[PDB]
C-alpha cells in the first residue's frame, strides 16, 4: 500500500518551536499552490484574492496557545491541503468557500422576528 | 429633621445590605435607628430595603429621569453614612 | 349557508346531497370533530385552482353509518360481550355493563348494547 | 432511634417505626407497589409489596410492616417472585383489554409492573367473562372508566385525608365493591383533579385531555405555575407548538406534588382569545397593523396628548413577568414619570404593608415551616380558594397534631376546623387581647396570616396596625430563628412588583388625571380610572377588558412561551422555562417595552435577556438567586413592623371580605379556558354545587 | 479542562454565542411511582425564541430550524456533565434536582 | 453524542448559481423524540454470577 500524493504521516509534535516551523512550511505550500487552485477549480477570482483568503484563515488561529490544539489544527490543515491539491473537492465546494458573503439594530431584528 | 429632608430630585432610595457578616453592621444599625426619622421628613419618598447574603453595603439613589447613582458604604462608620446620604442631595 | 359547512354538529339540520362537493362527506354536511378542518375551507386553496373536485377522495362519514345500526338488546343478562363480530379479525374482546337505563356503545366498534327491559325507555 | 436492618445484604438505617418499603428505597432496593404512596395513609389492600422476613413463616407487606433492629429482609427470593406473579395474575384477571383505547397506555404502572414482575402469559380463558362496572359521573374534570380500577383506594385516601372531601368512598362488598360516590353527584374539591395523577390505572383520567395524546409524544418542561402566588412547580407537557397538559412536580417546600384544578386545567385557554397581531383602533373597530406601524402610532399618540411628569400611568396585571415590570418602570422613569401601580383596588394609595420592607409583604415563615406551626391566625383570608395547596398543608398539620387555627373575617367552607371569632377589626382587637392572643404568645412557633384582600378593604390600615403592635410587643413572634408574620397573596406578580418598588407611595401622584396609560396585562380596571380622552396601550397575550379599553394593542407571550422571573408569596425567586413559541407575531413582553422605548426617545440600555436580568440585580440583589428565599434580618424586620404601628388611626368596623368571587375566573387565561366554563356550570363559583346540571 | 476543545470539534459557532444548554436531573413523573429516569444527569438546549416550531401549510407538519431540538445527552454524574459542558465552551446553567424530605410512615399512624 | 443526528446543513440546487450549494438545515417535519417514552422502571435485575470457581477470592475458614 502506497500513500496518495501529498500525504503526510501523522505525528504529535511535543515542541512548540518545532510546531511553528511546520505551520510556516505549510503556509508557504498554500501560497505556492494558489494559482493551481484557481486553474483546477476554475475560480472567478485571481490568485491574489486566494492568497488573501488563505492568510485570513491562518490568522484566525494565530493566537492559539495550547500545544495539543495546535497538533489537531495542523493535522486538519494538512488534510485540507491534500484535499485541494489532489482535486478531490468538487468545484462547487470551492466556489461556495469563496462565496462567504454592519449588523441590524435591535428594532430591525425586533420587527422581523430576530432569533 | 436636619438634612434628612431629601430634595425633589431624589425619588427612590435603595439600601443593599447582607443579613450576616461584619461589614453590614454599621449600615444595619444606622437603618434601624434613623429610618423612622428619615421617613418622617419624607412621608411619600420610597425607601426600599433589600437584603442578600454576602453583598457589600451600598445605597442606590434614583434621581430625575430615571438616573441612578450608586455609592458603596463598605468600612464606613455610622456618621459617615449619614453624611453620604446628605451629599446625594 | 357556510355555517353548517364549517361547524361541528351532532346532526345535520338538513339532508346531505351526494352530488354536493362542499360537504364534509358525501353522506354528511358538517364536520364531526372540533379540530376537523372543514372541507370547504380546505378546498379553497391555490392547489385546487385547476383541479376537478369530483375525483378527489371523499369517503363516507363513519359517524353517520354507525348510527344506522340498530341497538343490540340483551335478554336476561346485564353484561354485553363484543369482539368486532369477526373474532381473530376484529378487536380485543371487551365487556360492557348494561345496568344503566340507556344504550352504551362499544369502545372499538361503536355498536350500542342495552337490556331489553329498557327498550321502551330508550326508543322514546 | 436509628435501627440497623438488612435488605438483600445491604445495611440500612432509618427512624424507628419506618416501613420496610421506606428502608428498601433508602437502600436502593426497588419493591413493586400499587396501593402505597409516600403521601397517603398506609393501606395493605394490594399485596404487591410482599417481602420475606428472615426468621418468620409469613410474608409481610413492606408498606405496613414496621422496621426492627436486626431485621433482615429478602426481596428477591423465588418465593417472592411467585407472590409477585400470583398477585399480578389476580389484578389482570378481571381487568379489561382496554390499553389501545385507554389514556394511561404509555404511563401505566399496571402495565410496567406486570411486565417487570408478572408473567408473560395469562391463563384466564373463562367463558363467563370478566366483571363489568358502570361508569360513575363525578363532574366534567374526572373521566371514569371503572372497569380498569384495581381497588387500591388511593383516590379514597387522598380525597378524605388530603383534599378533605368525604363524598368519595368505597361502596359494596367483595367483587361487587365499586369506587365512587354511591349517589349521583360530583366531587367538590379544588384539589380533586390530583386524583387523576394518583390513580395508577386508567380508571380515573383527565376529561379535557382524553384521547388527545400519548405520553411518549410529549415534551416535558419544568416550569412554575402563575395562576396563584404560591409558585407551584409544574411539568408542562407539549406536543410541538401546543401545550397538551400540565402536571405537578415534586417540591416539598412549595407545592408537594399537588396543584389546584385551576392550575392544570386552564392550559386550554392558551388556544383561545389570544393576541397574535398588533391592533390599531379606528373609531369603533380594531384593525390589524405591523409592529412598525403599531409602535409608530403609539409614538404619534404620545405626542398628540403631550403628557407631563405624572400624566404617564403604568398598570401591571397579575400575570406580568418581572423583566417587563422593571423595563416598564425604567421607561416610565426615563419619561420623568412615577405613576406606576398594579391593577388592584387598594384603598390607601400606599398599601398598608408598604414596600420599604420585604418582611411586611412576604410569607416570612416560609411554606415549609407550616409543618412546625402550633398556632395559626387567619385574618380576612380564604386559603382554600386563594392558595389551594397551602390550605391542604395546614389540614395535614392539623390532622397530625393539636394545631389550632383561628379565623377573623368572612366565614367560608373549610377543610379543617376554624375557631371563628368575628368579621371586622373589632373582633381582631378582642382576640389579640383575649384568650386568642394568649395562645399565640405561649405558642412556640406561632403563625399569623393576613389575606391579600385586607388591603382592598376600608379597614386595611387598622388590620396591619393591630397585628404589628401585637407582633412587636410579643417577643416570641419575632426571634433570630422564627418570624410569625406572613402575608398570603393571590397574584404571582405582586411580590415581584413590590421587590422592585413598582408602586406609588405618594397620594398626590396617584390622583393625577393620566393622559397616556400603558396597560401591561392589566384587566381589573373597572374601578380604576381611565379618562375617555386618554391614550391607552395594552400589552398582553389575551384579548379581554384590557384589550377593549386600548387604542393600540401590543401582543405579548404567555408564561409558557418565555423565560420569565416570578417571585412568590414567600419571597422565593423562580424562573419560568419556555416550552413553545408565542403565536402569530407576538413578542417577548420585555422586548416590546425596549423596542417602544426607542420610538419614544428613551432607548433603554438593555439588548439581551442577560443584560435585562443584570438590571434586576441592580434594582434588587436577591432577584438573581433562583429557588432561594433571602430572609429579612431580625433587627430590620422589627423596624418594618414598628413602622406599621400607626397611632391615631380609627377602625371603621367593616367586613374583611374574601377577595376571590369565582374560583375558576381569576385571570385572563382562566377566563378564556373552555374547561373553566364547564367548571362554573357544574361545580359553581364557590365549588358548592353537589349536583351536575350540565351532565346528562 | 481549560482546553478550548470547541476549536477542533467542528460544531458551528452558534452553539457558543447564541444557544443555552441546561444541565438537569429529570424529575419524577407525577403519574408513575418509578424513579429509574431520575438516576442520570442530562443536557438539553433551550428552544429558539423563533423558529423552534412552525406549522407546514401543505400537511400540517411540525417544521423546525433548531438542529439541537432532538439532542439529549446522558451523563452518569453531575461532575461529568459540567466537565463536558466546560470542555465544549457552552453557555449553560444547572437546575439542582429537588430532594424529597423523609417522613416516617407506619400503619399504626392510621389510628395514632 | 453531541453531534445532532440531522447535522447542521443541507444541500440543494441553486438556479441562480447553476450549482449545488450548502444551506443551513431546515426540516419540513422536525424529528419527533419518542425516546422520552422509556420505561420509568428498571427492566433487568442485577443478573446471575457466572464467575468460575477458580477465579473467586477465597473465604477464610471460620473460627476454631
Ligand atoms: S389501565 Fe393500564 S393495563 Fe389497564 S387498560 Fe389502561 S393501559 Fe392497559
Ligand atoms: S380508582 Fe384508581 S386511585 Fe381509586 S382505588 Fe381504583 S385504581 Fe386506586
Ligand atoms: S404496596 Fe404494600 S400492600 Fe400495597
Ligand atoms: K390515572
Ligand atoms: Zn366491539
**Size (chain D), residues:** 696
Distance CA D218, CA E41 (A): 20
Place of cell 422576528: A113
Q: Check if A67 contacts E (Cβ < 8 Å).
A: no
Q: Check if F40 contacts D (Cβ < 8 Å).
A: yes
E51 contacts in D (CB within 8 Å)? 581
Q: Which cell numbers hold the place of B51?
A: 437584603
For residue D50, count other CB atoms closer than 10 A to its CB: 24
> Could you say which of D98, D133, D134 has the minimum Cβ distance to residue C94?
D98
Ligand number nearest CA of D151 is 2
Report CA D435 to chain centroid distance, whole Å.
34
Q: Are chains A and E in touch, 3+ Cβ pairs below 8 Å?
A: yes
Distance CA E21, CA E68 (A): 10
Angle of the D460-473 helix axis to the D425-433 helix axis, nearest 10: 10
- Cβ contact D676:D269 at 8 Å: yes
Q: Which atom of ligand 2 is nearest to the CA of D195?
A: 3
Nearest CA in chain D to F41: D112
Task: Please classify residue A98 by burial: count the beta carbons closer than 10 Å to its beta carbon, then call 0-12 exposed, 13-18 middle and 19+ buried.
Answer: middle
A114 contacts in E (CB within 8 Å)? 49-50
Distance CA D240, CA D88 (A): 37
A106 contacts in D (CB within 8 Å)? 594-595, 598, 607
For residue D45, count other CB atoms closer than 10 A to its CB: 12
Q: Which atom of ligand 1 is nearest to the CA of D103?
A: 6
> Could you say which of F37, F42, F45 has the minimum Cβ distance to residue D216?
F37
Q: D388 CB under 6 A from ligand 2?
A: no
Interval between CA D188 and ligand 3 midpoint (Å):
28
For residue D217, give the nearest of D249, D250, D243 by alpha carbon.
Answer: D243
Q: D329 CB under 6 A from ligand 1?
A: no
Q: Which cell numbers hold the place of D87?
A: 398477585
Q: Check if F30 contacts A (Cβ < 8 Å).
A: no
Q: Check if F45 contacts D (Cβ < 8 Å).
A: yes
Q: D102 CB under 6 A from ligand 1?
A: yes
Beta strand D573-575 pairing with D565-567: antiparallel
Q: Are chains D and B in touch, 3+ Cβ pairs below 8 Å?
A: yes
For residue D50, give the nearest of D26, D18, D85 by alpha carbon.
Answer: D85
- Which of the other chains make 3 or more beta carbon contacts under 8 angstroms with chain F? A, D, E
- Give the H or E element holding residue D499: helix D494-499
For residue D523, give the nearest of D501, D553, D478 by alpha carbon.
Answer: D553
E3 contacts in A (CB within 8 Å)? 66, 68-69
Q: D35 CB under 6 A from ligand 3?
A: yes
Beta strand D446-451 pairing with D485-488: parallel
Distance CA D393, CA D415 (A): 11
Interval between CA D49 and ligand 3 midpoint (Å):
5
Report CA D226 to chain centroid distance, whole Å.
7
Interval between CA D171 and ligand 2 midpoint (Å):
13
- Give the H or E element holding residue D295: helix D291-305
For residue D659, give the nearest of D316, D379, D259, D396 by alpha carbon.
Answer: D379
Interval between CA D176 and ligand 1 midpoint (Å):
20
C-beta atoms of E27 and D19 within 8 A: no
Strand, helix or coil at B23? coil
State the nearest Cα–Cα gap between F57 and chain E, in angstroms: 29
Which of E50, E67, E68, E83 is the mutation pick for testing F, counting most F CBs within 10 A?
E67
Which of D222, D393, D560 is the mutation pick for testing E, counting most E CBs within 10 A?
D222
Complete DSSP assignment for E51-66: TS-EE-TTT--EEB--
Ligand number nearest CA of D21 is 3
Dihedral over alpha carbons C73, C74, C75, C79 (to 10 degrees): -150
D200 contacts in F (CB within 8 Å)? none
Dihedral over alpha carbons E68, E70, E76, E81 (to 10 degrees): 20
State the nearest Cα–Cα gap between D98 and chain C, in angstroms: 8
- Cβ contact D382:D369 at 8 Å: no
Q: D270 CB under 6 A from ligand 2?
A: no
> Could you say which of B32, B55, B65 has the minimum Cβ distance to residue D639?
B32
Interval between CA D110 and ligand 1 midpoint (Å):
7
Dihedral over alpha carbons E4, E9, E13, E18 (to 10 degrees): -80
C-beta atoms of A110 and D585 within 8 A: no
D133 contacts in C (CB within 8 Å)? 97
Interval between CA D604 and ligand 1 midpoint (Å):
56
Beta bridge partners, D220, equal D237
Q: Which atom of ligand 3 is nearest to the CA of D64?
A: 2
- Which of the other chains make 3 or more beta carbon contacts under 8 angstroms with chain E? A, D, F
Beta strand D204-206 pairing with D142-144: antiparallel
Interval between CA D112 and ligand 4 midpoint (Å):
14
Distance CA D659, CA D656 (A): 9
Distances (CA, A) of D469 to D393, D434, D654, E9: 28, 15, 20, 66
Task: Please classify residue E101 by burial: count the beta carbons closer than 10 Å to its beta carbon, then call 0-12 exposed, 13-18 middle and 19+ buried.
Answer: exposed
Which residues have CB under 8 Å from A100's CB, separation 6+? none
Q: What DSSP character marks residue D287?
A: E
Task: Produce one character per residue of D510-540: b if its CB has 16 or more CB atoms within 10 Å, e if not.
Answer: bebebbbbbbbbbbbbeebeeeeebbbbbbb
Please compute, for residue D536, the number of CA atoms within 13 A of its CA located in the half-sphere on the CB side. Answer: 23
D221 contacts in F (CB within 8 Å)? none
Q: Which atom of ligand 2 is nearest to the CA of D154?
A: 3
For residue A60, count other CB atoms closer than 10 A to its CB: 11
Q: D150 CB under 6 A from ligand 2?
A: yes
Nearest CA in chain E to D242: E53
- Give the H or E element holding residue D536: strand D535-540
Q: D467 CB under 6 A from ligand 1?
A: no
C-beta atoms of D291 and A111 within 8 A: yes
Nearest CA in chain A to E65: A115
Q: D145 CB under 6 A from ligand 1?
A: no
Dihedral over alpha carbons D176, D180, D182, D186 (to 10 degrees): -160
Q: Which cell numbers hold the place of B19?
A: 443579613
Distance CA D582, CA D577 (A): 13
Q: D44 CB under 6 A from ligand 3?
A: yes
For residue E42, give the nearest of E60, E56, E22 by alpha carbon.
Answer: E22
C-beta atoms of D129 and C95 within 8 A: yes
C-beta atoms of B49 and D358 within 8 A: yes
Distances (CA, A) of F8 to D239, D319, F3, F27, F59: 23, 38, 9, 11, 58
Resolution of the experimentally solved model in angstroms = 2.8
Could you tell me if residue D63 is left (phi over 0), alpha (psi between -120 and 50 degrees) or otherwise beta?
alpha
Amino acid at each position: 500500500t502506497n500513500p496518495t500524493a501529498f500525504a503526510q504521516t501523522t505525528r504529535y509534535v511535543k515542541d512548540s518551536t518545532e510546531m511553528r516551523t511546520l505551520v510556516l512550511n505549510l503556509y508557504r505550500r498554500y501560497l505556492r499552490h494558489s494559482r493551481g487552485f484557481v486553474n483546477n477549480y476554475n475560480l472567478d477570482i485571481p490568485a491574489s484574492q486566494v492568497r488573501t483568503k488563505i492568510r485570513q484563515e491562518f490568522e484566525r488561529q494565530r493566537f492559539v496557545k495550547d500545544l495539543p490544539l495546535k497538533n489537531v489544527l495542523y493535522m486538519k490543515a494538512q488534510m485540507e491541503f491534500q484535499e485541494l491539491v489532489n482535486f478531490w473537492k468538487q468545484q462547487c465546494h470551492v466556489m461556495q468557500y469563496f462565496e462567504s458573503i454592519k449588523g441590524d439594530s435591535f428594532v430591525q431584528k425586533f420587527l422581523k422576528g430576530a432569533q | 429633621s436636619s438634612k434628612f429632608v431629601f430634595p425633589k430630585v431624589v425619588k427612590e432610595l435603595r439600601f443593599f445590605l447582607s443579613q450576616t457578616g461584619e461589614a453590614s453592621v454599621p449600615l444595619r444599625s444606622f437603618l434601624t435607628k434613623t429610618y423612622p426619622a428619615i421617613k418622617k421628613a419624607n412621608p411619600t419618598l420610597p425607601i426600599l430595603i433589600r437584603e442578600a447574603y454576602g453583598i457589600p453595603p451600598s445605597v442606590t439613589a434614583r434621581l430625575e429621569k430615571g438616573h441612578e447613582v450608586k455609592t458603596n458604604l463598605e468600612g464606613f462608620s455610622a456618621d459617615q453614612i449619614a453624611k453620604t446620604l446628605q451629599s446625594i442631595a | 349557508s357556510t355555517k353548517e359547512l364549517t361547524t361541528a354538529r351532532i346532526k345535520d339540520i338538513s339532508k346531505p346531497d351526494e352530488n354536493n362537493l362542499q360537504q364534509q362527506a358525501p353522506n354528511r354536511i358538517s364536520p364531526w370533530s372540533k379540530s376537523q378542518k372543514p372541507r370547504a375551507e380546505a378546498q379553497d386553496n391555490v392547489r385546487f385552482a385547476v383541479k376537478d373536485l369530483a375525483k378527489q377522495p371523499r369517503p363516507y362519514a363513519a359517524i353517520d353509518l354507525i348510527y344506522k345500526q340498530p341497538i343490540r338488546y340483551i335478554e336476561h343478562d346485564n353484561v354485553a360481550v363484543c369482539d368486532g363480530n369477526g373474532g381473530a379479525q376484529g378487536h380485543p374482546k371487551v365487556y360492557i355493563n348494561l345496568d344503566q337505563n340507556k344504550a352504551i356503545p362499544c369502545g372499538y366498534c361503536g355498536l350500542r348494547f342495552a337490556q331489553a327491559a329498557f327498550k321502551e325507555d330508550i326508543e322514546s | 432511634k436509628e435501627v440497623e436492618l438488612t435488605v438483600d445484604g445491604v445495611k440500612v438505617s432509618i427512624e424507628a417505626g419506618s416501613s420496610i418499603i421506606q428502608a428498601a428505597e433508602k437502600a436502593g432496593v426497588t419493591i413493586p407497589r400499587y396501593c402505597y404512596h409516600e403521601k397517603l395513609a398506609v393501606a395493605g389492600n394490594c399485596r404487591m409489596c410482599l417481602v420475606e422476613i428472615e426468621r418468620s413463616p409469613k410474608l409481610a407487606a413492606s408498606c405496613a410492616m414496621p422496621v426492627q433492629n436486626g431485621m433482615s429482609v429478602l426481596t428477591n427470593t423465588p418465593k417472592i417472585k411467585k407472590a409477585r406473579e400470583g398477585v399480578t395474575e389476580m389484578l389482570l384477571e378481571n381487568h379489561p383489554l382496554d390499553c389501545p383505547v385507554c389514556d394511561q397506555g404509555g404511563e401505566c404502572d399496571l402495565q410496567e409492573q406486570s411486565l417487570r414482575y408478572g408473567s408473560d402469559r395469562g391463563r384466564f380463558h373463562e367463558i363467563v367473562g370478566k366483571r363489568a362496572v358502570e361508569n360513575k359521573a363525578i363532574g366534567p374534570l374526572i373521566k371514569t372508566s371503572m372497569n380498569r380500577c384495581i381497588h387500591c383506594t388511593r383516590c379514597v385516601r387522598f380525597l378524605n385525608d388530603v383534599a378533605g372531601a368525604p363524598e368519595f368512598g368505597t361502596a359494596g362488598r367483595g367483587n361487587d365493591m365499586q369506587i365512587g360516590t354511591y349517589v349521583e353527584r360530583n366531587v367538590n374539591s379544588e384539589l380533586s383533579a390530583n386524583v387523576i395523577d394518583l390513580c395508577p390505572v386508567g380508571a380515573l383520567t383527565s376529561k379535557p385531555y382524553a384521547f388527545r395524546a400519548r405520553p411518549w409524544e410529549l415534551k416535558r418542561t419544568e416550569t412554575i405555575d402563575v395562576h396563584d402566588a404560591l409558585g407551584s412547580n409544574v411539568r408542562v407537557d407539549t406536543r410541538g407548538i401546543e401545550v397538551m397538559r400540565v402536571l405537578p412536580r415534586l417540591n416539598d417546600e412549595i407545592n408537594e406534588e399537588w396543584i389546584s384544578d385551576k392550575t392544570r386545567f386552564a392550559c386550554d385557554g392558551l388556544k383561545t382569545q389570544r393576541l397574535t397581531k398588533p391592533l390599531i383602533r379606528q373609531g369603533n373597530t380594531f384593525v390589524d397593523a405591523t409592529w412598525e406601524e403599531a409602535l409608530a402610532t403609539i409614538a404619534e399618540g404620545f405626542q398628540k396628548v403631550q403628557p407631563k411628569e405624572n400624566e404617564i400611568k403604568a398598570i401591571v396585571g397579575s400575570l406580568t413577568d418581572l423583566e417587563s415590570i422593571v423595563a416598564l418602570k425604567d421607561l416610565v422613569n426615563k419619561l420623568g414619570s412615577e405613576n406606576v401601580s398594579t391593577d388592584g383596588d387598594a384603598t390607601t394609595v400606599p398599601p398598608a404593608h408598604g414596600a420599604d420592607f420585604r418582611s411586611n409583604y412576604i410569607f416570612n415563615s416560609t411554606i415549609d415551616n407550616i409543618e412546625e406551626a402550633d398556632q395559626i391566625l387567619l385574618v380576612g383570608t380564604n386559603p382554600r380558594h386563594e392558595a389551594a395547596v397551602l390550605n391542604a398543608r395546614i389540614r395535614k398539620v392539623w390532622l397530625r397534631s393539636d394545631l389550632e387555627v383561628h379565623h377573623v373575617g368572612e366565614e367560608f367552607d373549610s377543610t379543617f376546623e376554624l375557631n371563628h371569632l368575628g368579621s371586622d377589626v373589632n373582633a381582631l382587637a378582642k382576640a389579640l387581647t383575649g384568650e386568642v392572643g394568649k395562645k399565640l404568645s405561649e405558642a412556640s412557633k406561632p403563625l399569623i396570616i393576613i389575606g391579600s384582600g385586607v388591603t382592598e378593604t376600608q379597614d386595611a390600615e387598622a388590620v396591619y396596625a393591630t397585628v404589628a403592635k401585637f407582633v412587636t410587643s410579643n417577643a416570641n413572634i419575632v426571634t433570630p430563628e422564627w418570624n410569625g408574620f406572613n402575608l398570603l397573596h393571590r397574584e404571582a406578580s405582586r411580590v415581584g412588583a413590590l421587590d422592585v418598588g413598582f408602586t406609588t407611595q405618594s397620594p398626590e401622584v396617584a390622583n393625577t388625571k393620566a393622559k397616556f396609560i400603558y396597560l401591561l396585562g392589566a384587566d381589573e380596571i373597572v374601578n380604576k380610572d381611565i379618562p375617555k380622552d386618554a391614550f391607552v396601550v395594552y400589552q398582553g397575550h389575551h384579548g379581554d377588558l384590557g384589550a377593549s379599553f386600548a387604542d393600540v394593542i401590543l401582543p405579548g407571550s404567555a408564561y409558557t412561551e418565555k423565560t420569565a422571573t416570578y417571585v412568590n408569596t414567600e419571597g422565593r425567586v423562580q424562573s419560568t422555562r419556555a416550552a413553545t413559541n408565542p403565536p402569530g407575531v407576538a413578542r417577548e413582553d420585555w422586548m416590546i417595552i425596549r423596542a417602544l422605548s426607542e420610538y419614544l426617545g428613551a432607548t433603554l440600555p438593555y439588548d439581551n435577556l442577560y443584560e435585562m436580568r443584570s438590571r434586576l440585580a441592580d434594582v434588587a440583589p436577591h432577584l438573581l438567586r433562583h429557588e432561594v428565599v433571602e430572609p429579612v434580618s431580625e433587627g430590620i424586620a422589627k423596624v418594618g413592623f414598628q413602622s406599621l404601628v400607626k397611632p391615631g388611626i380609627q377602625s371603621k368596623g367593616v367586613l374583611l371580605k374574601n377577595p376571590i368571587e369565582n374560583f375558576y375566573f381569576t385571570d385572563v387565561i382562566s377566563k378564556s379556558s373552555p374547561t373553566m366554563a364547564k367548571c362554573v356550570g357544574s361545580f359553581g363559583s364557590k365549588i358548592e354545587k353537589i349536583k351536575d346540571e350540565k351532565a346528562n | 479542562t481549560d482546553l478550548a476543545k470547541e476549536l477542533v470539534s467542528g460544531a458551528p459557532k452558534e452553539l457558543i454565542t447564541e444557544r443555552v444548554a441546561r444541565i438537569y436531573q429529570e424529575a419524577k413523573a407525577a403519574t408513575q411511582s418509578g424513579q429509574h429516569n431520575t438516576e442520570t444527569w442530562k443536557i438539553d438546549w433551550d428552544i429558539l425564541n423563533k423558529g423552534n416550531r412552525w406549522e407546514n401549510d401543505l400537511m400540517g407538519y411540525q417544521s423546525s430550524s433548531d438542529y439541537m431540538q432532538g439532542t439529549i445527552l446522558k451523563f452518569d454524574t453531575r461532575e461529568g456533565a459540567i466537565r463536558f459542558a466546560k470542555g465544549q465552551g457552552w453557555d449553560y446553567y444547572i437546575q439542582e434536582p429537588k430532594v424529597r424530605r423523609f417522613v416516617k410512615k407506619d400503619y399504626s399512624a392510621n389510628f395514632y | 453524542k453531541d453531534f445532532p443526528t440531522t447535522g447542521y446543513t443541507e444541500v440543494r440546487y441553486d438556479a441562480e448559481k447553476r450549482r449545488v450549494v450548502y444551506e443551513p438545515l431546515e426540516l419540513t417535519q422536525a424529528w419527533r423524540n419518542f425516546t422520552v417514552g422509556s420505561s420509568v422502571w428498571e427492566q433487568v435485575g442485577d443478573g446471575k454470577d457466572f464467575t468460575p470457581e477458580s477465579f473467586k477470592l477465597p473465604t477464610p475458614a471460620p473460627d476454631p
